[PDB]
Short mmCIF file of C-alpha atoms and ligand atoms in Angstrom, two decimals:
data_model
loop_
_atom_site.label_atom_id
_atom_site.label_comp_id
_atom_site.label_asym_id
_atom_site.label_seq_id
_atom_site.Cartn_x
_atom_site.Cartn_y
_atom_site.Cartn_z
CA UNK T 1 -7.34 1.91 6.40
CA UNK T 2 -7.83 -0.17 3.21
CA UNK T 3 -11.17 -1.82 3.84
CA UNK T 4 -9.80 -5.27 3.12
CA UNK T 5 -10.44 -8.31 5.33
CA UNK T 6 -7.00 -9.51 6.51
CA UNK T 7 -8.31 -12.35 8.70
CA UNK T 8 -6.35 -14.94 6.65
CA UNK T 9 -2.95 -13.28 7.12
CA UNK T 10 -1.81 -13.63 10.67
CA UNK T 11 -2.00 -17.39 10.89
CA UNK T 12 0.28 -18.26 8.08
CA UNK T 13 2.71 -15.44 8.99
CA UNK T 14 3.06 -17.00 12.41
CA UNK T 15 3.64 -20.39 10.72
CA UNK T 16 6.53 -18.96 8.67
CA UNK T 17 8.09 -17.36 11.71
CA UNK T 18 7.72 -20.47 13.86
CA UNK T 19 11.01 -22.27 13.72
CA UNK T 20 9.28 -25.35 15.02
CA UNK T 21 6.72 -25.40 12.23
CA UNK T 22 9.07 -26.75 9.61
CA UNK T 23 6.24 -27.47 7.16
CA UNK T 24 5.67 -23.78 6.46
CA UNK T 25 8.55 -21.57 5.26
CA UNK T 26 6.64 -19.30 2.78
CA UNK T 27 3.22 -17.96 2.03
CA UNK T 28 1.70 -16.17 -0.97
CA UNK T 29 -1.51 -14.23 -0.60
CA UNK T 30 -3.93 -13.34 -3.29
CA UNK T 31 -6.50 -10.63 -3.35
CA UNK T 32 -10.26 -11.08 -3.80
CA UNK T 33 -12.80 -8.26 -4.20
CA UNK T 34 -16.56 -8.04 -3.40
CA UNK T 35 -15.92 -8.73 -0.69
CA UNK T 36 -12.33 -7.34 -0.45
CA UNK T 37 -10.22 -9.99 1.28
CA UNK T 38 -6.81 -11.61 1.19
CA UNK T 39 -6.64 -15.39 0.74
CA UNK T 40 -3.84 -17.91 0.73
CA UNK T 41 -2.66 -18.70 -2.79
CA UNK T 42 0.20 -20.94 -1.75
CA UNK T 43 1.85 -22.10 1.47
CA UNK T 44 4.51 -24.64 2.24
CA UNK T 45 8.11 -25.54 2.32
CA UNK T 46 10.45 -23.49 0.19
CA UNK T 47 11.60 -19.97 -0.35
CA UNK T 48 12.01 -17.52 -3.17
CA UNK T 49 11.66 -19.95 -6.05
CA UNK T 50 8.43 -21.33 -4.65
CA UNK T 51 7.08 -17.85 -4.14
CA UNK T 52 8.01 -16.88 -7.68
CA UNK T 53 6.19 -19.87 -9.03
CA UNK T 54 3.03 -18.69 -7.39
CA UNK T 55 3.19 -15.08 -8.58
CA UNK T 56 0.77 -14.43 -11.50
CA UNK T 57 1.25 -11.84 -14.22
CA UNK T 58 -2.31 -10.65 -13.94
CA UNK T 59 -2.55 -10.42 -10.19
CA UNK T 60 -1.95 -8.26 -7.11
CA UNK T 61 -0.29 -10.52 -4.48
CA UNK T 62 1.87 -10.47 -1.37
CA UNK T 63 4.47 -12.91 -0.22
CA UNK T 64 6.40 -13.65 2.91
CA UNK T 65 9.20 -16.18 3.44
CA UNK T 66 12.06 -17.18 5.68
CA UNK T 67 15.65 -17.52 4.62
CA UNK T 68 19.12 -17.82 6.25
CA UNK T 69 21.90 -15.23 6.17
CA UNK T 70 25.40 -15.46 7.59
CA UNK T 71 29.10 -15.33 6.85
CA UNK T 72 28.40 -18.08 7.92
CA UNK T 73 28.37 -18.32 11.73
CA UNK T 74 26.25 -16.80 13.02
CA UNK T 75 23.68 -18.18 10.55
CA UNK T 76 20.51 -16.28 11.34
CA UNK T 77 16.91 -16.50 10.14
CA UNK T 78 15.77 -13.55 8.05
CA UNK T 79 12.31 -12.74 6.73
CA UNK T 80 11.51 -11.31 3.27
CA UNK T 81 8.29 -9.36 2.50
CA UNK T 82 7.31 -8.90 -1.15
CA UNK T 83 4.47 -6.88 -2.68
CA UNK T 84 3.62 -7.91 -6.23
CA UNK T 85 1.66 -6.03 -8.93
CA UNK T 86 1.83 -8.01 -12.14
CA UNK T 87 2.18 -6.15 -15.41
CA UNK T 88 -1.01 -7.90 -16.69
CA UNK T 89 -3.37 -6.53 -14.05
CA UNK T 90 -6.44 -5.42 -15.99
CA UNK T 91 -8.01 -2.96 -13.51
CA UNK T 92 -6.07 0.18 -12.69
CA UNK T 93 -8.35 0.72 -9.66
CA UNK T 94 -6.91 -2.52 -8.21
CA UNK T 95 -3.30 -1.24 -8.86
CA UNK T 96 -4.19 1.96 -7.04
CA UNK T 97 -5.15 0.19 -3.81
CA UNK T 98 -1.73 -1.39 -3.53
CA UNK T 99 -0.08 1.05 -1.25
CA UNK T 100 -2.95 1.49 1.28
CA UNK T 101 -3.52 -2.35 1.27
CA UNK T 102 0.28 -2.95 1.65
CA UNK T 103 0.33 -0.68 4.70
CA UNK T 104 -2.48 -2.70 6.36
CA UNK T 105 -0.68 -5.96 5.46
CA UNK T 106 2.57 -4.70 6.99
CA UNK T 107 0.83 -4.04 10.21
CA UNK T 108 0.21 -7.73 10.52
CA UNK T 109 3.52 -8.76 8.74
CA UNK T 110 5.64 -6.58 10.98
CA UNK T 111 8.72 -8.80 11.29
CA UNK T 112 10.76 -8.52 8.08
CA UNK T 113 14.34 -7.75 7.22
CA UNK T 114 13.76 -6.62 3.70
CA UNK T 115 10.77 -5.33 1.74
CA UNK T 116 10.62 -5.53 -2.06
CA UNK T 117 8.05 -4.34 -4.50
CA UNK T 118 8.06 -6.29 -7.79
CA UNK T 119 6.18 -6.13 -11.04
CA UNK T 120 8.21 -8.73 -12.92
CA UNK T 121 10.00 -11.92 -11.97
CA UNK T 122 13.23 -10.24 -12.96
CA UNK T 123 12.78 -8.01 -9.93
CA UNK T 124 13.18 -11.05 -7.68
CA UNK T 125 16.64 -12.64 -7.80
CA UNK T 126 18.06 -14.72 -5.05
CA UNK T 127 21.57 -13.34 -5.15
CA UNK T 128 20.31 -9.76 -5.21
CA UNK T 129 18.04 -10.30 -2.23
CA UNK T 130 20.84 -12.18 -0.31
CA UNK T 131 23.23 -9.26 -0.91
CA UNK T 132 20.51 -6.77 0.29
CA UNK T 133 20.01 -8.82 3.44
CA UNK T 134 23.78 -9.00 4.08
CA UNK T 135 23.79 -5.14 3.74
CA UNK T 136 20.85 -4.48 6.08
CA UNK T 137 22.49 -6.93 8.58
CA UNK T 138 25.65 -4.74 8.85
CA UNK T 139 23.84 -1.35 8.98
NA1 NA Y 1 7.91 -22.16 9.93
#
């Protein structure tokens, strides 16, 4: 529905999910226009902090990472999906595409335990997301 090229998405998503690809635990995607396409902004080892480091105040981005949840045993792998619309984005037409683009992205990034929308780094706090995961686990 969005008109964006998502060709770059599936590969790295599979990398994050793949337990045997230990070199990739997160990915951050950025958004290019004319032509409208997602690209990889960052990808590697790490989690939330690494994602946060890659999120830009003037950008529309998406992120996806793996984390562990458990009390402990059973420790289980959980996946976090974040949409990001920085408070510095200059074009309100780009802000407006967020939800339709997000929907297309979630059809590729279909395996997640929590979804968060953030506009500030304060929206993304490890303990808060861990507690949310622990909650969705026992629902
Ligand atoms: Na991986």
